[PDB]
Amino acid sequence: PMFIVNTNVPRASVPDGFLSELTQQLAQATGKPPQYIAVHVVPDQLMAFGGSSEPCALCSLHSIGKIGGAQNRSYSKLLCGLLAERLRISPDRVYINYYDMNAANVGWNNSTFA
Amino acid sequence: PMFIVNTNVPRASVPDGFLSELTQQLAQATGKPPQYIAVHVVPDQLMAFGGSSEPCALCSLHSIGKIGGAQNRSYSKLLCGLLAERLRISPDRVYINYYDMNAANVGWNNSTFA
Amino acid sequence: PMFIVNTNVPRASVPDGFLSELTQQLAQATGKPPQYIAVHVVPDQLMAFGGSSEPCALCSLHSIGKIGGAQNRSYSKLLCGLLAERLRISPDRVYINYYDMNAANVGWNNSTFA
């Protein structure tokens, strides 16, 4: 899995350990081995949500499987929870796009997962 | 809906009010309330288009519905128009990827839009 | 086609001519004219792969066609090769998401490619 968060929260407000916390909790939520989890946090962004520049986040979670209605609801609770607690972003100012990737469409280690 | 623009145009060349103008015009184009529109502008990027580094943009528009052949042509005219007028980017140096998102595949406020 | 690389490798470690090399190599690999190839490199990113902040990359290749099982394996060998040689990133610390875009879902020059 790959999780990306783009946010207007400044870099200094991203707590130490945040990438590890994301890695751990995503491994647990998706069932995937931690070795396969990639995380990416992009602070200091020029963004607006609902016309407002209050703290917000635009995110994506890509995974080969483990994507669906119930699972995505669970991931959203988890991830909005972390963004609220750690970055002080209101859950109603977060969008997360979920992508169920075909194994043939994910490159890794000179090949694909197909 | 969520609109992201990545560009090599410098930050100082992004005019005051641009995020609001994007929010307003996207609300109108998609027919969705501005409260549901997110916008994200990423200047100063290391990019090339067609082998050269004159102003260019790589963009995405994600929406739950309101995506299709005719609608996307209309969005492209609108968005290229704005990028040309405000950021001085030639329309022939802009790509916009359109994504019709399933409601169950968009997280928001601890759950999804399903 | 459009190729984006997000990496924690610092800007100074990205070789002069990297964007041009990517453009030429992708033109050859996809068979598309270089005029249609866009490339985007984002260094200095806060990211982890497998919980580790050793050099890594999260990438995407979007193309209207020229995406499939065998082609994506070939692209992965090519692009991992380039990231290893030029950015010193291990191929097992690279993800590349492939997207076969519908022509109607790619905006360019005030319209779409449909």
Side-chain angles (χ1 to χ4, degrees), chain A residues 1-87 89-114, chain B residues 1-10 12-114, chain C residues 1-10 12-23 25-84 86-114:
Chain A
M2 181 188 313
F3 180 64
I4 303 154
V5 40
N6 305 265
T7 180
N8 57 349
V9 167
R11 169 67 182 98
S13 297
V14 180
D16 286 355
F18 190 55
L19 299 181
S20 291
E21 190 177 30
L22 289 170
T23 300
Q24 293 164 343
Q25 297 199 18
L26 285 162
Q28 295 171 305
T30 64
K32 299 267 190 181
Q35 75 188 260
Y36 292 98
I37 306 283
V39 297
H40 179 195
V41 176
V42 194
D44 296 292
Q45 296 301 289
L46 181 60
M47 46 173 60
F49 188 111
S52 161
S53 57
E54 288 291 327
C56 61
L58 299 174
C59 311
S60 50
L61 179 68
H62 296 77
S63 182
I64 300 167
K66 304 296 182 60
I67 298 291
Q71 289 171 108
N72 299 353
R73 278 193 290 287
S74 189
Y75 302 149
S76 298
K77 181 177 174 186
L78 173 74
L79 293 164
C80 290
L82 285 164
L83 294 168
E85 178 187 19
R86 304 305 184 202
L87 300 188
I89 302 169
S90 186
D92 66 358
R93 296 183 57 73
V94 176
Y95 283 156
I96 308 160
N97 290 140
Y98 295 101
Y99 302 95
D100 187 358
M101 299 301 292
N102 191 293
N105 291 331
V106 181
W108 174 74
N109 196 211
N110 301 134
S111 192
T112 68
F113 284 102
Chain B
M2 58 207 105
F3 178 69
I4 306 95
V5 47
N6 302 267
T7 182
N8 56 348
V9 166
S13 299
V14 181
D16 286 359
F18 190 54
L19 295 189
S20 285
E21 191 176 27
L22 288 173
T23 298
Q24 291 165 346
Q25 301 206 15
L26 283 162
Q28 294 171 314
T30 63
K32 299 290 175 177
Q35 287 92 165
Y36 284 85
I37 302 284
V39 297
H40 180 194
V41 176
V42 192
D44 295 291
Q45 293 304 287
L46 180 64
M47 34 174 68
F49 188 110
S52 66
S53 52
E54 303 85 17
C56 61
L58 296 178
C59 311
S60 306
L61 180 68
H62 298 79
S63 180
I64 299 166
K66 313 309 296 185
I67 297 291
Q71 289 172 105
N72 296 355
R73 281 187 287 274
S74 187
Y75 300 146
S76 296
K77 183 183 180 172
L78 172 70
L79 294 163
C80 291
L82 285 161
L83 294 170
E85 185 80 343
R86 305 304 186 202
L87 301 186
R88 317 311 290 181
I89 302 164
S90 185
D92 70 357
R93 297 180 58 74
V94 174
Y95 283 155
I96 305 160
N97 289 141
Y98 295 100
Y99 303 92
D100 189 354
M101 300 301 295
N102 295 344
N105 290 333
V106 183
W108 171 73
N109 199 42
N110 308 313
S111 190
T112 67
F113 277 108
Chain C
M2 51 209 127
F3 181 62
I4 299 102
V5 185
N6 305 265
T7 179
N8 57 348
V9 168
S13 295
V14 180
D16 285 354
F18 190 53
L19 292 185
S20 292
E21 182 173 35
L22 289 170
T23 300
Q25 290 297 300
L26 283 165
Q28 188 180 81
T30 63
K32 298 293 174 174
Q35 292 89 168
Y36 287 87
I37 304 285
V39 292
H40 179 196
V41 177
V42 194
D44 298 292
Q45 294 304 288
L46 183 60
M47 56 168 58
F49 192 114
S52 160
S53 56
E54 290 291 325
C56 59
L58 308 177
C59 310
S60 308
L61 180 67
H62 297 78
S63 181
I64 298 164
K66 314 310 296 188
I67 299 290
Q71 288 171 104
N72 297 355
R73 282 188 285 277
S74 183
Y75 297 147
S76 297
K77 184 173 180 174
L78 172 74
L79 295 163
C80 287
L82 284 163
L83 294 167
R86 304 302 185 198
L87 302 188
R88 313 308 299 172
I89 302 167
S90 182
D92 65 359
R93 296 185 55 74
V94 175
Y95 280 149
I96 306 163
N97 287 326
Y98 296 98
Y99 302 93
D100 187 357
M101 302 300 295
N102 295 343
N105 290 333
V106 183
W108 171 73
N109 194 46
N110 305 321
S111 192
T112 66
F113 277 110

